[PDB]
């Protein structure tokens, strides 16, 4: 299935995944293409934060679903 | 104009599934650095 990851730069990252995929694995794919450390990768699903130790099925994430990506740095 | 909150970024942050309230408060403690604001608001 295909999903749409929205970046803080208004970019739409189209990735190939499946319900049986883990959040950690999803972020790993983003990390390879975007070059952003998975530790700073905060995935959001309709305002809800996604746990790395879960699967897409845990949140009933189906095809054509929009996921958000917040770049959480260290500091302020 | 005391527009410390950039319109573009406000919409971007809210589009992530967050209310304007979270944006204002997070931005208030960051001072324009919405990237850090998101890092702050997302710790809840």
From Swiss-Prot, chain A:
The modification Phosphoserine is found at residue 65. It comes from the Eukaryota. Residues 1-76 form the Ubiquitin-like domain. There is a cross-link at residue 76 (Glycyl lysine isopeptide (Gly-Lys) (interchain with K-? in acceptor proteins)). The modification ADP-ribosylglycine is found at residue 76. Phosphorylated at Ser-65 by PINK1 during mitophagy. Phosphorylated ubiquitin specifically binds and activates parkin (PRKN), triggering mitophagy. Phosphorylation does not affect E1-mediated E2 charging of ubiquitin but affects discharging of E2 enzymes to form polyubiquitin chains. It also affects deubiquitination by deubiquitinase enzymes such as USP30. Changing residue 72 to G: No effect on ADP-ribosylation. The record marks 68 as: Essential for function. The record marks 54, 72 as: Interacts with activating enzyme. Changing residue 68 to G: Loss of DTX3L-mediated polyubiquitination of histone H3 and H4. It is a peripheral membrane protein. The modification (Microbial infection) ADP-ribosylthreonine is found at residue 66. Changing residue 76 to A: Loss of ADP-ribosylation. It is found in: Cytoplasm; Nucleus; Mitochondrion outer membrane. There is a cross-link at residues 6, 11, 27, 29, 33, 48, 63 (Glycyl lysine isopeptide (Lys-Gly) (interchain with G-Cter in ubiquitin)). Exists either covalently attached to another protein, or free (unanchored). When covalently bound, it is conjugated to target proteins via an isopeptide bond either as a monomer (monoubiquitin), a polymer linked via different Lys residues of the ubiquitin (polyubiquitin chains) or a linear polymer linked via the initiator Met of the ubiquitin (linear polyubiquitin chains). This is Ubiquitin. It comes from Homo sapiens. The gene is UBB. The chain holds residues 1 to 76 of 229 of the full protein.
From Swiss-Prot, chain B:
Present with 6510 molecules/cell in log phase SD medium. Aspartic protease. Appears to act as negative regulator of constitutive exocytosis. May act at the level of secretory vesicle docking and fusion as a competitive inhibitor of SNARE assembly. Acts as a linker between the 19S proteasome and polyubiquitinated proteins like the HO endonuclease and UFO1 via UBA domain interactions with ubiquitin for their subsequent degradation. Required for S-phase checkpoint control. The lineage of its organism: Eukaryota, Fungi, Dikarya, Ascomycota, Saccharomycotina. Residues 4-43 form the UBA domain. It comes from the Eukaryota. It is found in: Cytoplasm; Cell membrane. Induction: By DNA damage via PDR3. Belongs to the DDI1 family. The chain holds residues 389 to 428 of 428 of the full protein. Forms homodimers. Interacts with RAD23. These interactions are mediated by the UBA domain. Is also able to bind ubiquitin and polyubiquitinated proteins. Interacts with the SNAREs SNC1, SNC2, SSO1, TLG1 and TLG2. Binding to SSO1 is promoted by the phosphorylation of 'Ser-49' of SSO1 by TKP1. This is DNA damage-inducible protein 1.
């Amino acid at each position: 299935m295909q999903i749409f990851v929205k970046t803080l730069t208004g970019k739409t990252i189209t990735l190939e995944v499946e319900p049986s995929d883990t959040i950690e694995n999803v972020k790993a794919k983003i990390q390879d293409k975007e070059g952003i450390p998975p530790d700073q990768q905060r995935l959001i699903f309709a305002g809800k934060q996604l746990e790395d130790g879960r699967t897409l099925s845990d949140y009933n994430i189906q095809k054509e679903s929009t996921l958000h990506l917040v770049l959480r740095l260290r500091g302020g | 104009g005391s527009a410390t909150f950039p319109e573009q970024t406000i919409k971007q942050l809210m589009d992530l599934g967050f209310p304007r309230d979270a944006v204002v408060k997070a931005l208030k403690q960051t001072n324009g650095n919405a990237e850090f604001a998101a890092s702050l608001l997302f710790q809840s």
